[PDB]
Design an enzyme around this catalytic site. Structure first.
Site, PDB file in Angstrom:
ATOM      1  N   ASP A 138      80.134  99.894 -10.460  1.00 58.93           N
ATOM      2  CA  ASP A 138      79.007 100.480  -9.797  1.00 58.93           C
ATOM      3  C   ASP A 138      77.931  99.464  -9.342  1.00 58.93           C
ATOM      4  O   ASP A 138      78.167  98.261  -9.382  1.00 58.93           O
ATOM      5  CB  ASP A 138      78.436 101.562 -10.665  1.00 58.93           C
ATOM      6  CG  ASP A 138      77.753 100.973 -11.857  1.00 58.93           C
ATOM      7  OD1 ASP A 138      77.889  99.664 -12.073  1.00 58.93           O
ATOM      8  OD2 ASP A 138      77.077 101.657 -12.541  1.00 58.93           O
TER       9      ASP A 138
ATOM     10  N   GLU B 159      75.868 110.943  -7.033  1.00 57.04           N
ATOM     11  CA  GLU B 159      76.619 109.985  -7.745  1.00 57.04           C
ATOM     12  C   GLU B 159      77.798 109.491  -7.037  1.00 57.04           C
ATOM     13  O   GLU B 159      78.162 108.375  -7.294  1.00 57.04           O
ATOM     14  CB  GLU B 159      76.922 110.411  -9.226  1.00 57.04           C
ATOM     15  CG  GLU B 159      75.626 110.614 -10.009  1.00 57.04           C
ATOM     16  CD  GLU B 159      75.200 109.427 -10.806  1.00 57.04           C
ATOM     17  OE1 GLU B 159      75.503 108.286 -10.529  1.00 57.04           O
ATOM     18  OE2 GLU B 159      74.404 109.763 -11.800  1.00 57.04           O
TER      19      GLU B 159
END
Length: 164
Positions: A20, A11
């Site tokens: 993101d 992640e």
């Protein structure tokens, strides 16, 4: 190899609010703050999460607390899920981490919908599993992560994360 090491590999770790791959404000290790195009909502969501006024900035500690709550929710997700439970309950410790990794990313319900795949995992049919997982969207979208995970199940080792 522990869950923390894997997910940070998967992640990433960010101490300030960021957008993101999907354009979503996040922080820490995959913690989704909001899907709204709005730093304010994001900052207030962060504040509610941590408990302090951080102004879009966190420490390694907080990043860790969050992460801890995140994985528990994942794990509690699988345990409450009828399709997942049996799967989780039958895999080994290495393979279970891989399961936890998918739930973390895509949620209890998205994984739950990998019906066949999940079945073969039950039936100890790793290569059958491997191939189905691959025929997914998930795989197309984050092929490098997907493949790491898929290799965890297939091989039953940390082979995919030891040398990066």
């Amino acid at each position: 190899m522990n869950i923390f090491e894997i997910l940070r590999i998967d992640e990433g770790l960010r101490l300030k609010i960021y957008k993101d791959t999907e354009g979503y404000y996040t922080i820490g290790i995959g913690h989704l703050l909001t899907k709204s195009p709005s730093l304010n909502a994001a900052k207030s969501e962060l504040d509610k999460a941590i408990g302090r006024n951080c102004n879009g900035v966190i420490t390694k500690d907080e990043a860790e607390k969050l992460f801890n709550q995140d994985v528990d929710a994942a794990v509690r997700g699988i345990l409450r899920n009828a399709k997942l439970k049996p799967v989780y309950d039958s895999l080994d410790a290495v393979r279970r981490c891989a399961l936890i990794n998918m739930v973390f990313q895509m949620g209890e319900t998205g994984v739950a919908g990998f019906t066949n795949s999940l079945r073969m995992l039950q039936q100890k049919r790793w290569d059958e599993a491997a191939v189905n997982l691959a025929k997914s969207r998930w795989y197309n979208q984050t092929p490098n992560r997907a493949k790491r995970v898929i290799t965890t199940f297939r091989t039953g080792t940390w082979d995919a994360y030891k040398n990066l």
